Amino acid sequence: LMQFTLPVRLCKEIELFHFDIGPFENMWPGIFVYMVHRSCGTSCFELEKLCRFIMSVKKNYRRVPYHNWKHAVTVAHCMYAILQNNHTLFTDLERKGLLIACLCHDLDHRGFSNSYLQKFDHPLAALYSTSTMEQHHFSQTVSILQLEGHNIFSTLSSSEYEQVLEIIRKAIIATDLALYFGNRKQLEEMYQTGSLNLNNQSHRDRVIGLMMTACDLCSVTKLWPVTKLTANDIYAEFWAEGDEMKKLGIQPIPMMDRDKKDEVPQGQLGFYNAVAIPCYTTLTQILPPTEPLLKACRDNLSQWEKVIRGEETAT
Ligand SMILES: COCCn1ncc(NC(=O)c2nc(C3CC3)ccc2Nc2cncnc2)c1C(=O)N(C)C
Ligand SMILES: [Mg+2]
Ligand SMILES: [Zn+2]
Numbered sequence: 001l002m003q004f005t006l007p008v009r010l011c012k013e014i015e016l017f018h019f020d021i022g023p024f025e026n027m028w029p030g031i032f033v034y035m036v037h038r039s040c041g042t043s044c045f046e047l048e049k050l051c052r053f054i055m056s057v058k059k060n061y062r063r064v065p066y067h068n069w070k071h072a073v074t075v076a077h078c079m080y081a082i083l084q085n086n087h088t089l090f091t092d093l094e095r096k097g098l099l100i101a102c103l104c105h106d107l108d109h110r111g112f113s114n115s116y117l118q119k120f121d122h123p124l125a126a127l128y129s130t131s132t133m134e135q136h137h138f139s140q141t142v143s144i145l146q147l148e149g150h151n152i153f154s155t156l157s158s159s160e161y162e163q164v165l166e167i168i169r170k171a172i173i174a175t176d177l178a179l180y181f182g183n184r185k186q187l188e189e190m191y192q193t194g195s196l197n198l199n200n201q202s203h204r205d206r207v208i209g210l211m212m213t214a215c216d217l218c219s220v221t222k223l224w225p226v227t228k229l230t231a232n233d234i235y236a237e238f239w240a241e242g243d244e245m246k247k248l249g250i251q252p253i254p255m256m257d258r259d260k261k262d263e264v265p266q267g268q269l270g271f272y273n274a275v276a277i278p279c280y281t282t283l284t285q286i287l288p289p290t291e292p293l294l295k296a297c298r299d300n301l302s303q304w305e306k307v308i309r310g311e312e313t314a315t
Contacts, residue, residue, distance in 0.1 A: 001042065004034040017081045017218075017292040020226045021073050028073045029054045032103065035080040040095045045152045053152045056144045060107050065236035067109035076102035078218035078293075082211055085289035089198065093156075097164040098208065100141075100152070101171035102215055107140035109133065111237040112244070114178070119248055131176040138172045167208070174209030175216045177275070183209045184282050191285050207286055214283045214293060220276045221296040224303045228314055235264060265307040265314065272301040 006014060013019050014031070021031055032054060036044060061069040079102045083090060090098070114132045117125045128135035142165070144150055153161050174183065187206050190196040197203050219230040235255075242256030254260045255267045280294035306312040 002047070003042070004030060004037050006031070006034055014077065015081070015084065017078065018222050018226070018296050019077055019081070020222060021070065021077060025069070028069065029058070032073055032076055032099070035077060036099055039080050039083045039099060044096055046154070049149060049152050049154070053144065053150050054103070056147060056150060057103055057107065060140055060144065062108065062110060064109060064111040066233040067106045067111055067237065072103050072106060075105060075215045075218065078215035078221070079211065082215070082287065082290055086287050089287070093160060093164045094167060094208070096153070097167035098171060098211075101168045101212070104141040104144070104168070105137055105172045105175050105212070105216065107137045107144070109137070112241050114176070116241050116244060119245065119250055131173050131179065134173050134176045138169050141168060141172065170205055171208055171212045174212040177213070179209070180213045180279070184213070184278060187282055187286065191282070196286065210279070210283055210286070213279055214290065217276055217279060218293065220272065220300055221280070221293045223296070224300060227300045227303070231264070231268065265304050268304040269301070269308060272297065272304065277301065
Protein backbone atom coordinates (compact mmCIF):
# COMPACT_ATOMS: atom_id res chain seq x y z
CA LEU A 1 0.00 0.00 0.00
CA MET A 2 0.91 3.72 -0.29
CA GLN A 3 0.65 5.17 3.28
CA PHE A 4 0.53 9.00 3.68
CA THR A 5 3.34 10.23 5.97
CA LEU A 6 4.14 13.75 7.34
CA PRO A 7 7.54 15.20 8.32
CA VAL A 8 8.47 14.36 11.96
CA ARG A 9 7.39 17.74 13.49
CA LEU A 10 3.94 17.65 11.71
CA CYS A 11 3.46 13.91 12.54
CA LYS A 12 3.78 14.77 16.29
CA GLU A 13 2.12 18.22 16.35
CA ILE A 14 -1.00 17.39 14.17
CA GLU A 15 -2.25 15.27 17.18
CA LEU A 16 -2.22 18.51 19.35
CA PHE A 17 -5.51 20.53 19.31
CA HIS A 18 -3.58 23.86 18.83
CA PHE A 19 -1.73 22.57 15.66
CA ASP A 20 -1.46 25.29 12.94
CA ILE A 21 -1.46 23.78 9.38
CA GLY A 22 1.28 26.21 8.19
CA PRO A 23 1.59 28.60 5.21
CA PHE A 24 2.29 25.98 2.48
CA GLU A 25 -1.12 25.62 0.68
CA ASN A 26 0.31 22.67 -1.38
CA MET A 27 0.70 20.52 1.82
CA TRP A 28 -2.95 20.98 3.04
CA PRO A 29 -4.48 18.26 0.73
CA GLY A 30 -1.83 15.77 2.01
CA ILE A 31 -2.53 16.84 5.65
CA PHE A 32 -6.32 16.26 5.09
CA VAL A 33 -5.82 12.76 3.49
CA TYR A 34 -3.49 11.84 6.40
CA MET A 35 -6.19 12.88 8.92
CA VAL A 36 -8.88 10.93 6.91
CA HIS A 37 -6.65 7.73 6.71
CA ARG A 38 -5.97 7.88 10.51
CA SER A 39 -9.47 9.00 11.78
CA CYS A 40 -11.58 6.95 9.25
CA GLY A 41 -9.16 4.39 7.70
CA THR A 42 -7.25 3.95 4.39
CA SER A 43 -10.29 2.00 2.97
CA CYS A 44 -12.95 4.73 3.74
CA PHE A 45 -12.42 6.41 0.29
CA GLU A 46 -10.70 5.72 -3.08
CA LEU A 47 -7.58 8.01 -2.99
CA GLU A 48 -8.17 9.12 -6.64
CA LYS A 49 -11.82 10.27 -5.97
CA LEU A 50 -10.93 11.85 -2.56
CA CYS A 51 -8.02 13.72 -4.23
CA ARG A 52 -10.32 14.96 -7.07
CA PHE A 53 -13.02 15.95 -4.53
CA ILE A 54 -10.44 17.83 -2.37
CA MET A 55 -9.12 19.82 -5.38
CA SER A 56 -12.71 20.71 -6.54
CA VAL A 57 -13.65 21.87 -2.98
CA LYS A 58 -10.39 23.97 -2.87
CA LYS A 59 -11.39 25.55 -6.22
CA ASN A 60 -14.85 26.60 -4.87
CA TYR A 61 -13.39 28.45 -1.82
CA ARG A 62 -12.70 32.14 -2.56
CA ARG A 63 -9.63 34.40 -2.05
CA VAL A 64 -11.07 36.08 1.10
CA PRO A 65 -9.04 36.97 4.22
CA TYR A 66 -10.59 34.39 6.64
CA HIS A 67 -13.49 32.20 5.24
CA ASN A 68 -11.01 30.51 2.87
CA TRP A 69 -9.44 27.11 2.02
CA LYS A 70 -7.03 27.40 5.04
CA HIS A 71 -10.09 27.85 7.38
CA ALA A 72 -11.81 24.71 5.88
CA VAL A 73 -8.70 22.54 6.54
CA THR A 74 -8.11 24.15 9.99
CA VAL A 75 -11.75 23.37 10.99
CA ALA A 76 -11.27 19.79 9.61
CA HIS A 77 -8.07 19.38 11.72
CA CYS A 78 -9.91 20.44 14.94
CA MET A 79 -12.57 17.79 14.05
CA TYR A 80 -9.70 15.22 13.55
CA ALA A 81 -8.33 16.02 17.08
CA ILE A 82 -11.86 15.62 18.65
CA LEU A 83 -12.48 12.29 16.81
CA GLN A 84 -8.99 10.81 17.62
CA ASN A 85 -9.27 11.63 21.40
CA ASN A 86 -12.91 10.26 21.46
CA HIS A 87 -12.47 7.32 19.01
CA THR A 88 -14.96 4.91 20.76
CA LEU A 89 -17.90 7.42 20.65
CA PHE A 90 -18.55 7.87 16.84
CA THR A 91 -20.00 5.60 14.08
CA ASP A 92 -18.30 4.63 10.75
CA LEU A 93 -20.63 7.02 8.81
CA GLU A 94 -20.01 9.86 11.34
CA ARG A 95 -16.18 9.50 10.88
CA LYS A 96 -16.72 9.43 7.04
CA GLY A 97 -19.11 12.45 6.97
CA LEU A 98 -17.67 14.87 9.62
CA LEU A 99 -14.16 15.52 8.17
CA ILE A 100 -15.90 16.11 4.78
CA ALA A 101 -18.57 18.38 6.42
CA CYS A 102 -15.73 20.51 7.97
CA LEU A 103 -13.78 20.79 4.67
CA CYS A 104 -16.98 21.85 2.83
CA HIS A 105 -18.68 23.89 5.58
CA ASP A 106 -17.89 27.41 4.17
CA LEU A 107 -17.83 26.48 0.43
CA ASP A 108 -18.11 29.61 -1.81
CA HIS A 109 -18.13 32.05 1.21
CA ARG A 110 -17.85 35.69 -0.11
CA GLY A 111 -16.78 37.09 3.34
CA PHE A 112 -20.31 38.40 4.23
CA SER A 113 -22.68 37.32 7.04
CA ASN A 114 -26.33 36.13 6.65
CA SER A 115 -27.38 39.63 8.00
CA TYR A 116 -25.63 41.53 5.14
CA LEU A 117 -27.15 39.15 2.52
CA GLN A 118 -30.61 39.88 4.12
CA LYS A 119 -30.05 43.70 4.17
CA PHE A 120 -28.59 43.64 0.57
CA ASP A 121 -31.64 41.59 -0.66
CA HIS A 122 -29.21 38.97 -2.14
CA PRO A 123 -30.97 36.22 -4.20
CA LEU A 124 -29.64 33.56 -1.70
CA ALA A 125 -31.77 35.35 1.02
CA ALA A 126 -34.95 34.69 -1.13
CA LEU A 127 -33.90 31.03 -1.69
CA TYR A 128 -32.83 30.34 1.97
CA SER A 129 -34.67 32.63 4.48
CA THR A 130 -32.65 31.30 7.52
CA SER A 131 -29.04 29.93 7.70
CA THR A 132 -28.75 31.54 4.20
CA MET A 133 -24.98 30.99 3.60
CA GLU A 134 -24.97 27.59 5.40
CA GLN A 135 -27.77 26.23 3.11
CA HIS A 136 -25.67 27.57 0.16
CA HIS A 137 -22.49 25.83 1.54
CA PHE A 138 -24.45 22.51 1.67
CA SER A 139 -25.91 22.98 -1.86
CA GLN A 140 -22.33 23.61 -3.13
CA THR A 141 -21.23 20.38 -1.31
CA VAL A 142 -23.97 18.35 -3.13
CA SER A 143 -22.97 19.99 -6.52
CA ILE A 144 -19.32 18.86 -6.09
CA LEU A 145 -20.35 15.33 -4.85
CA GLN A 146 -22.48 15.00 -8.09
CA LEU A 147 -19.55 15.83 -10.49
CA GLU A 148 -18.08 12.93 -12.55
CA GLY A 149 -15.43 10.92 -10.58
CA HIS A 150 -16.32 12.94 -7.39
CA ASN A 151 -18.68 10.41 -5.65
CA ILE A 152 -16.37 9.72 -2.63
CA PHE A 153 -19.28 7.70 -1.05
CA SER A 154 -19.84 5.43 -4.16
CA THR A 155 -19.40 2.14 -2.14
CA LEU A 156 -22.12 3.17 0.41
CA SER A 157 -25.63 1.69 -0.13
CA SER A 158 -28.46 4.17 -1.02
CA SER A 159 -29.66 4.34 2.63
CA GLU A 160 -26.03 4.85 3.92
CA TYR A 161 -25.29 7.61 1.34
CA GLU A 162 -28.56 9.31 2.49
CA GLN A 163 -27.57 9.06 6.23
CA VAL A 164 -24.05 10.51 5.59
CA LEU A 165 -25.42 13.41 3.44
CA GLU A 166 -27.85 14.06 6.34
CA ILE A 167 -24.95 13.98 8.89
CA ILE A 168 -23.15 16.47 6.55
CA ARG A 169 -26.26 18.66 5.99
CA LYS A 170 -26.93 18.99 9.76
CA ALA A 171 -23.20 19.56 10.59
CA ILE A 172 -22.88 22.40 8.00
CA ILE A 173 -26.21 24.01 9.08
CA ALA A 174 -24.98 23.81 12.75
CA THR A 175 -22.08 26.23 11.82
CA ASP A 176 -24.76 29.02 11.70
CA LEU A 177 -23.83 30.62 15.08
CA ALA A 178 -27.44 32.01 15.29
CA LEU A 179 -28.43 28.28 15.90
CA TYR A 180 -25.59 27.59 18.44
CA PHE A 181 -27.11 29.67 21.34
CA GLY A 182 -30.26 27.43 21.42
CA ASN A 183 -28.29 24.17 20.79
CA ARG A 184 -25.76 24.75 23.65
CA LYS A 185 -28.61 25.79 26.08
CA GLN A 186 -30.51 22.50 25.29
CA LEU A 187 -27.23 20.49 25.74
CA GLU A 188 -26.51 22.35 29.06
CA GLU A 189 -30.07 21.49 30.39
CA MET A 190 -29.85 17.84 29.09
CA TYR A 191 -26.41 17.37 30.78
CA GLN A 192 -27.38 18.92 34.20
CA THR A 193 -30.73 16.95 34.33
CA GLY A 194 -28.85 13.75 33.22
CA SER A 195 -31.26 13.29 30.22
CA LEU A 196 -28.42 13.50 27.56
CA ASN A 197 -28.32 10.12 25.72
CA LEU A 198 -25.71 9.49 22.94
CA ASN A 199 -27.95 6.52 21.80
CA ASN A 200 -30.71 9.09 20.94
CA GLN A 201 -30.12 10.32 17.29
CA SER A 202 -31.72 13.77 18.04
CA HIS A 203 -29.11 14.06 20.90
CA ARG A 204 -26.17 12.91 18.67
CA ASP A 205 -27.28 15.69 16.24
CA ARG A 206 -26.93 18.39 18.99
CA VAL A 207 -23.54 17.02 20.21
CA ILE A 208 -22.20 17.03 16.57
CA GLY A 209 -23.67 20.56 16.12
CA LEU A 210 -21.67 21.69 19.17
CA MET A 211 -18.56 19.85 17.90
CA MET A 212 -18.98 21.85 14.60
CA THR A 213 -19.25 25.20 16.48
CA ALA A 214 -16.12 24.26 18.51
CA CYS A 215 -14.20 23.31 15.29
CA ASP A 216 -15.49 26.45 13.49
CA LEU A 217 -14.29 28.83 16.32
CA CYS A 218 -11.05 26.80 16.95
CA SER A 219 -8.85 29.83 16.03
CA VAL A 220 -9.54 31.09 19.64
CA THR A 221 -7.99 27.71 20.78
CA LYS A 222 -4.56 28.12 19.09
CA LEU A 223 -1.41 29.42 20.85
CA TRP A 224 -1.65 33.26 21.31
CA PRO A 225 0.59 34.27 18.33
CA VAL A 226 -1.67 32.22 15.93
CA THR A 227 -4.92 33.50 17.57
CA LYS A 228 -3.74 37.17 17.42
CA LEU A 229 -2.64 36.93 13.74
CA THR A 230 -5.83 35.03 12.75
CA ALA A 231 -7.91 37.79 14.48
CA ASN A 232 -6.45 40.29 11.89
CA ASP A 233 -7.87 38.06 9.06
CA ILE A 234 -11.38 37.81 10.61
CA TYR A 235 -11.52 41.62 11.22
CA ALA A 236 -10.41 42.27 7.58
CA GLU A 237 -13.75 40.60 6.55
CA PHE A 238 -15.86 42.21 9.35
CA TRP A 239 -14.60 45.73 8.41
CA ALA A 240 -15.26 45.12 4.65
CA GLU A 241 -18.85 44.02 5.58
CA GLY A 242 -19.16 47.15 7.81
CA ASP A 243 -18.08 49.28 4.80
CA GLU A 244 -20.75 47.53 2.65
CA MET A 245 -23.37 48.20 5.43
CA LYS A 246 -22.38 51.94 5.38
CA LYS A 247 -22.76 51.88 1.53
CA LEU A 248 -26.38 50.55 2.08
CA GLY A 249 -26.93 53.52 4.49
CA ILE A 250 -27.08 51.19 7.55
CA GLN A 251 -24.90 51.78 10.65
CA PRO A 252 -22.86 48.56 11.11
CA ILE A 253 -22.54 46.93 14.58
CA PRO A 254 -19.32 48.14 16.33
CA MET A 255 -17.12 45.05 15.58
CA MET A 256 -17.66 45.60 11.78
CA ASP A 257 -16.77 49.35 11.94
CA ARG A 258 -13.10 49.89 10.88
CA ASP A 259 -13.25 53.33 12.67
CA LYS A 260 -13.75 51.42 16.04
CA LYS A 261 -10.40 49.43 15.84
CA ASP A 262 -9.37 50.53 19.40
CA GLU A 263 -12.40 48.53 20.82
CA VAL A 264 -11.29 45.16 19.26
CA PRO A 265 -9.73 43.90 22.57
CA GLN A 266 -12.98 44.68 24.52
CA GLY A 267 -14.99 43.14 21.59
CA GLN A 268 -12.80 40.00 21.80
CA LEU A 269 -13.33 39.87 25.61
CA GLY A 270 -17.15 40.15 24.97
CA PHE A 271 -16.96 37.27 22.43
CA TYR A 272 -14.86 34.89 24.65
CA ASN A 273 -17.28 35.44 27.63
CA ALA A 274 -20.61 35.26 25.68
CA VAL A 275 -19.73 32.56 23.04
CA ALA A 276 -16.31 30.82 23.12
CA ILE A 277 -15.84 29.90 26.85
CA PRO A 278 -19.46 28.64 27.23
CA CYS A 279 -18.97 26.59 23.96
CA TYR A 280 -15.75 24.76 25.03
CA THR A 281 -17.08 24.43 28.66
CA THR A 282 -20.20 22.50 27.44
CA LEU A 283 -18.04 20.50 24.96
CA THR A 284 -15.56 19.50 27.75
CA GLN A 285 -18.56 18.39 29.93
CA ILE A 286 -19.85 16.04 27.15
CA LEU A 287 -16.38 15.09 25.70
CA PRO A 288 -13.82 15.43 28.56
CA PRO A 289 -10.78 14.74 26.27
CA THR A 290 -11.55 18.12 24.46
CA GLU A 291 -10.28 19.93 27.68
CA PRO A 292 -7.24 21.37 25.77
CA LEU A 293 -9.62 23.46 23.55
CA LEU A 294 -11.19 25.07 26.71
CA LYS A 295 -7.73 25.54 28.37
CA ALA A 296 -6.25 27.31 25.26
CA CYS A 297 -9.50 29.39 25.00
CA ARG A 298 -9.02 30.54 28.68
CA ASP A 299 -5.28 31.33 28.03
CA ASN A 300 -6.23 33.58 25.00
CA LEU A 301 -9.03 35.29 27.09
CA SER A 302 -6.28 36.10 29.68
CA GLN A 303 -4.13 37.51 26.76
CA TRP A 304 -6.98 39.85 25.61
CA GLU A 305 -7.34 41.08 29.24
CA LYS A 306 -3.52 41.70 29.23
CA VAL A 307 -4.08 43.75 25.98
CA ILE A 308 -6.95 45.81 27.58
CA ARG A 309 -4.61 46.63 30.60
CA GLY A 310 -1.86 47.81 28.15
CA GLU A 311 0.58 45.00 29.18
CA GLU A 312 0.36 43.49 25.61
CA THR A 313 0.07 45.36 22.19
CA ALA A 314 -1.91 44.14 19.09
CA THR A 315 -1.01 46.31 15.97
C1 LIG B 1 -23.20 40.05 17.96
O1 LIG B 1 -21.88 39.87 17.42
C2 LIG B 1 -20.88 40.79 17.90
C3 LIG B 1 -19.98 40.18 18.99
N1 LIG B 1 -18.73 39.58 18.44
N2 LIG B 1 -17.54 40.09 18.56
C4 LIG B 1 -16.62 39.35 17.98
C5 LIG B 1 -17.29 38.24 17.41
N3 LIG B 1 -16.76 37.14 16.73
C6 LIG B 1 -15.46 36.81 16.50
O2 LIG B 1 -14.52 37.51 16.86
C7 LIG B 1 -15.24 35.51 15.79
N4 LIG B 1 -16.27 34.92 15.15
C8 LIG B 1 -16.16 33.76 14.53
C9 LIG B 1 -17.38 33.21 13.81
C10 LIG B 1 -18.73 33.35 14.52
C11 LIG B 1 -18.43 34.20 13.28
C12 LIG B 1 -14.94 33.08 14.52
C13 LIG B 1 -13.84 33.62 15.20
C14 LIG B 1 -13.98 34.87 15.85
N5 LIG B 1 -12.92 35.50 16.54
C15 LIG B 1 -11.57 35.16 16.30
C16 LIG B 1 -10.54 35.45 17.22
N6 LIG B 1 -9.27 35.09 16.99
C17 LIG B 1 -8.96 34.47 15.87
N7 LIG B 1 -9.90 34.19 14.96
C18 LIG B 1 -11.19 34.51 15.12
C19 LIG B 1 -18.67 38.39 17.72
C20 LIG B 1 -19.81 37.48 17.34
O3 LIG B 1 -20.58 37.12 18.22
N8 LIG B 1 -20.10 37.04 16.07
C21 LIG B 1 -21.27 36.18 15.84
C22 LIG B 1 -19.33 37.39 14.88
MG1 LIG C 1 -19.75 29.52 7.98
ZN1 LIG D 1 -16.31 28.45 9.22
